[PDB]
Amino acid sequence: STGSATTTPIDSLDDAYITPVQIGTPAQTLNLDFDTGSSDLWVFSSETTASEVDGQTIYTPSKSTTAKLLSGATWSISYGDGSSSSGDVYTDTVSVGGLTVTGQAVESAKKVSSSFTEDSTIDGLLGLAFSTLNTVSPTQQKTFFDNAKASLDSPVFTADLGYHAPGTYNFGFIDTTAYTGSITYTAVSTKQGFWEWTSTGYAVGSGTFKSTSIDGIADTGTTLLYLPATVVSAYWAQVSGAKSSSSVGGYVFPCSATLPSFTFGVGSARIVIPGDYIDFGPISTGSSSCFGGIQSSAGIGINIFGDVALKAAFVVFNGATTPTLGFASK
Predict the structure, then answer these.
(1) What's the CA angle centered on 145, arms 113 and 52, to 5 degrees?
(2) What is the span of the domain harbouring residue 28?
C-alpha cells in the first residue's frame, strides 16, 4: 500500500504545516501537525476541557463505530517549546492520504497548554519519530508509520515541505519526480528515539564550506534551524545590524536586510537554504526588527534541522531495519 497527503502552512510565515487525517467511522477529518520529533498521535476531542478549546476541530469517539477505549491507558507529553498535553486513549481506524491503519492509538486530550488552545489551525499532532518515545502508559503504543510499515510497498515516508506553499507527505514510495539530481543517504542513530544524523558541515552565502560534524535531528515539528552558537554567529555576522536579543529570545536583524543563503552538508552533497527562507518577519506587528530563522541550539541540548532546513530538500525517512535519512535538492 501507499499513501499521499498534501501538507499546508498554517500561516504566512510557515510556522507549522497541517495535514488532513481521517479518524473513525464515519470519518472525522482533523488537521494534524506531522512531527518527526515526537511519537504520539494526539487530538483535540470531546473530552478536552471546554475552556482549552478555541476553534479546533475535535474528535468525538462516541460518534465512531470503530472507536474502543484502551482501558487504563493514559498519556502526557511535554515538547521542547514548553507546551504540553495529556489525556486518555482510544484505538480507532486512521487514514492518511488513502493509507489506512486499523487499531491505531488515538490519544484524546483532556488537557492542553495555552499555545495549543491559541493555535485554532492545529487539531493535534501525528508523531513520526521512533515508537520508543511514545508516552502511553502502562502499554507503550506504536506510531502510525510503525503500524503501517509492514503493509507499505517500501518501509519509508518522505517529507516535501513547501516554502510559503503546500507540500506533500508520502508513505510507502519515493516520488522520483519530486526532486532533482540524486538522493544522498546518511546514517541514523535511534539511541534517543529521533531521526538523528550527522551533517558534514556548512557554508554561509557564497563563502567556503567548513567541514565539521554537526549531530542533529530531522524534526518537521520544529519551525526553525537550531545549530551550535559558533555556526549561528558565523551566519549572522554576515548581516549588517544583526544581533542576539535576550529580550526577544534570539537573533534579530533589520527588516531592510537581504539575507545570505545557508548551506548544510549531507555526506559529499550540499543542501542550500535560500536567504528568504531565514526571514520570519517583524518581531511584533509594524516593527523594523525581524526574527531570524537560524537560532542557537545552546541550552536546548540538541541541534534541530527543523522546517527552515527541511523545506529546502526532499527528505526520505527510511524505516528499514537499519534506518537511514535521504536528502535531495528540489
Answers:
(1) 15
(2) 5-174
Residue indicated by cell numbers 534506518: 323
Alpha-carbon gap, residue 328 to 197, rounded angstroms: 15
Active-site positions? Answer: 35, 199
The Cα 313–Cα 245 span in angstroms is: 30
Contact 70, 90 (CB under 8 A): yes
Resolution number, Å = 1.2
Q: Residue 34, Cα to own-chain centre: how many angstroms?
A: 6
DSSP code, position 45: B
Chosen domain end from 174, 209, 240? 174
CA angle 73, 85, 38 (to 5 degrees): 85
Task: Examine the fold and report which residue of 174, 209, 225 is the final residue of a domain before the chain moves on.
Answer: 174
Domain match, 121 and 146 both? yes
**How was this model experimentally determined?**
X-ray
Q: Which element (helix H / strand E) includes 230? A: helix 229-236
Evaluate whether 90 touches 80 at the Cβ level (below 8 Å).
Answer: no
* CATH value at residue 209: 2.40.70.10
